[PDB]
Design a protein around this ligand. Structure first.
Ligand SMILES: O=C(O)c1ccccc1-c1ccccc1C(=O)Nc1ccc2c(c1)[nH]c(=O)c1ccccc12
Ligand SMILES: [Cl-]
Ligand SMILES: [Cl-]
Length: 115
């Protein structure tokens, strides 16, 4: 059920999203900007391993379209995106290092959400 704080909290989420997409973080955020194009990358097993792809452009579309009803729903998608990276890639891959850095940005600011 919607709470009177959900709009406020979703603004905090949108602020985080905007930060994740900003130039500040581009050196490590860029792999997460758009859906993984598995064929283009030669990742022909990606969609056998990753059942629920997620990326920041999809999170942005969902936010713009008011698809997210609360902050928890938003956070679950951002975390899904990172988990897909941790699932698919060896843990020493540079994309995993990038994901961990971007997730640290996310988690520290998400934990400042007004309530
Ligand atoms: O070549 C390597 O990079 C390599 C290095 C170490 C071990 C294996 C390989 C490899 C070997 C053969 C073919 C391809 C790869 C490879 O892993 N590529 C690749 C490229 C882009 C992304 C990705 C994986 N995985 C993501 O999760 C992802 C998420 C967002 C955007 C892009 C990517
Ligand atoms: Cl994905
Ligand atoms: Cl979660």
């Amino acid at each position: 059920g919607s709470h009177m704080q959900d709009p406020e909290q979703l603004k905090h989420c949108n602020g985080i999203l905007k930060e994740l997409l900003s130039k500040k973080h581009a050196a490590y955020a860029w792999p997460f900007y758009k859906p993984v194009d598995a064929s283009a990358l030669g990742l022909h097993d990606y969609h056998d391993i990753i059942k629920h792809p997620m990326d920041l452009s999809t999170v942005k579309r969902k936010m713009e379209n008011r698809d997210y009803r609360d902050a928890q729903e938003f956070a679950a998608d951002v975390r899904l995106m990172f988990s897909n990276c941790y699932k698919y890639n060896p843990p020493d891959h540079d994309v995993v290092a990038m994901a961990r850095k971007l997730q640290d940005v996310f988690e520290f600011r998400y934990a400042k959400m007004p309530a």
